[PDB]
Symmetry: D2
Subunit: 282 residues, 4 copies
């Protein structure tokens, strides 16, 4: 009953640490849902990856939106899309925001990097962008999460903060502060400086050893597990493909994998079996 946009809104603004898991297609979206996660992360790298292309705007934004439409169709929990820089200027970003709203997607995460191709995009430009998105939403609960690439690009806390504040002031519903460092330093230094001006979102891929409660004490609002399903999937597929190739039989894979009937259950095949008995004449 609760709108997906709204569910994501509540998680960002909640005073408790929330988690969203990555998914990259309709199938993974259902699995993340059944597992119990309260939200899905539409990973830009995972989506371009499963398509077999590079994470550098190769697939058009509409090809990415369609993958997300199928993902949205197969889940009841909100999906926060990793939308790069919005695939163009403020106009492309607002057009994207309206299409996602209509597809059932709950929010979009935009970063302040240059597009296409450590200078980044102008703060005022990217601020006007968030604001454009914010002024274009037809659903007040759709979320725009601003991602600051200051630390990653080599700038200091100063650049980060200045950016986060400009974005939060433009209307961002949350700030995703990232760091490629192997520990949470840029983040702890940010958390102190931030002053809790708004919910903060982190991607602990590189400092994954840092305990999670440490994120609770820093006041962090939401954590993103960024790409582990794509990575888990590739390993399993590489393994099974090698296994079958070498064996020239299925004897060594059949019991190490999900049955065909578990596939049908995930596709909700029974609902159709039942609709067909009710809708197909005698």
């Amino acid at each position: 009953k609760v709108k997906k946009t709204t569910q994501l809104k509540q998680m960002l603004n909640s005073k408790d640490l929330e988690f969203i898991m990555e998914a990259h297609n309709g199938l993974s979206a259902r699995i993340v849902q059944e597992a119990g996660f309260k939200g899905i992360w539409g990973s830009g790298l995972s989506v371009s990856a499963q398509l077999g292309v590079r994470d550098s705007n190769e697939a058009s934004w509409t090809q990415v939106v369609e993958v997300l439409e199928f993902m949205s169709d197969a889940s009841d929990v909100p999906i926060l899309l990793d939308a790069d820089t919005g695939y163009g200027n403020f106009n492309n970003a607002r057009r994207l925001v309206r299409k996602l709203e209509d597809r059932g997607v709950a929010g979009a995460c935009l970063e302040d990097k240059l597009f296409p191709k450590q200078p980044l995009a102008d703060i005022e430009e990217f601020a006007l962008k968030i604001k454009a998105c914010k002024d274009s939403q037809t659903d007040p609960d759709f979320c725009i999460v601003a991602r600051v690439e200051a630390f990653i690009a080599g700038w200091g806390l100063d650049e980060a903060l200045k950016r986060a504040e400009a974005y939060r002031n433009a209307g961002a519903d949350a700030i995703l502060m990232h760091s490629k460092k192997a520990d949470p330093s840029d983040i702890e230094a940010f958390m102190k400086a931030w002053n809790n001006q708004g919910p903060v979102v982190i991607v602990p891929t590189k400092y994954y050893k840092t305990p999670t409660d440490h994120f609770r004490d820093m006041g962090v609002s939401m954590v993103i597990w960024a790409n582990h399903n794509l990575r888990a999937s590739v390993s399993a597929i590489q393994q099974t493909t090698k296994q079958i190739y070498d064996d020239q039989s299925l004897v060594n894979v059949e019991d190490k994998i999900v049955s065909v009937k578990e596939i049908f259950r995930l596709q909700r095949d029974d609902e159709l079996v039942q609709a067909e008995d009710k809708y197909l004449p005698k």
Copy 2:
């Protein structure tokens, strides 16, 4: 080098047993190519399932073609698409055949069942024998690449009609131009396949899917003279397995520490995406 259509055509007509592996997206199509496989099976179940829908004509034929376009861009070996019934009558089938050729797809597999399902131990009626035969012919008459392949999937055994139907249909489709016949069975044993091969007298290449009777020694297929085997959906199933387990572990743990060393690295993904080429090209084309 050699056209993908030609590579698939040579596999279908070769004397030895050939194998093709299931892929359902660009990523899995590259992994299959890397493993050494000489071809890819564009599984209908695997494609619809990754999209999250049922294997019953929900995604449009152009949404399926699009998934396959990515698969073909990411692989050098032929892809044989499971094209259900051609998505309509003979006219929809030839239009599909033209789009697949243009997309780099090597062939299409069409099955003789009714479409769409209009009716809810009596055998299940299939398509009219003369009608399906003409659809195969319409496709052969329409393809622009002489080596594109039309594989005819016979549903007789599965639908409850014995060997008698299976052979009349296979003969009718082969005679209509099919490049190969795919004989399937509901059984957990190869008996239907065995009986058909015995009666077929090698009138044309035969393709099979050992999914339900997987314990059957592979050498036995070679003895029947089967031309190709299709490993139908195991990459999709291994993926579900891996994603269900990785998700549950991170959900429970609320940390990555217990999965980080059981999945490939992010750099492995970059290599599958051929990130290196982009690097080298931006060096050659960016001021």
Copy 3:
């Protein structure tokens, strides 16, 4: 404003004779709204044609839905889509309906011909109309059932037997079609229908019959089915032939709209104002 679905339902249930005009792409949808029409008919023949294909389900349903997404994005009045037979069985229909809602389309018209002169089984099609009514999430989304009995050669008995089956199944309106050059089939149906539900007609073949005669018969709505497409084609043919021969633009430049008119139709204006506000000076 009010929901497009609701606008269409009110027009069908209205006691006034309503009119919806054919559009086949984003541009034509926009022109139809500006003219004043309270609704748009997403003609199956027009969409197919503009794409350069036959009206025999050659382009796919998602390709047709995308054309309509652009049309819906470009208009404020409801678009009723000609969805042929729903592009498959009941399941394909209910999936289609769901996507049309999400894209802003107001309703869909489904015909009882066989897919891909016998028609689809009555019960089967009725159960399909039902599946759509049971699946739609916007209660105002309109499902229009098109009876092809008269065109199929059958008689008034069939047309009636089928109109009643479909309406009892939940259809929001019945489109009664005839190939005749006079309204004989339509007047006979209306006489024996006893107003069991709103009726929709397409006066394409009997366009000489005064429109007031339909009002008198109690017809709820009329569809101008393909005139903008036919108009666009005869102008493009003449424009192309004139430039081709002349090898010059001097003899067409004054018979066609200026490029400024095109920009206005694109709401290019709103973007300039937007770039003015969102792009840093």
Copy 4:
């Protein structure tokens, strides 16, 4: 004879060639039935028919699909107005590949900044590499890359129109589209004097349309693009037909001023399908 080959031949030929604009499958077939040897897939025309603005709103794959349909409905080549390639050199090459597979004979690219951040034009050096990048990726040697120079539209001199034009020609361009917003061919005449027949030249005489055609043959121009007239003509017929039916609530005043339904079935090649249904359905 390949479509790509057919185009290249028109660009490097002796006579002045003409290509007429089309924006969908239906208009492409009309352009062909009329006798034109080529089709101009107008950016303005394609986005307009979709009802969006000519500013990169429709994704590049959405544009490619429209062109795919046009391609299937015509036997003569189509030169596609591809903005700046929809991204950097990489986006540009991917577009070229997909265009070749779709049967498009060529892409026309312009030397401007993308996206808009608003007159500076694209770095001369970068566009040159962009042009090259596309040339190096072709799989068909006869696929044409037309470089459109905006110097004169950007407000630069002839010295800049020739500087860019010569650079893009050395990069690989198959032709040079010199455009001028003047209502006379002065700019075109000036550039033609300067150019020194270093490559085929294409012009868009939309504004200076009173200029006699032989004048263009004289200067040595290789091809003329009738840029947007079928769209404009269509729009006139639609606004008029629509107004006429709205007012009269009848079709008696348009039924004799429009083509017939049979004519539509003919243009759709309906008879070709009847013949097929004949031979392929029991």
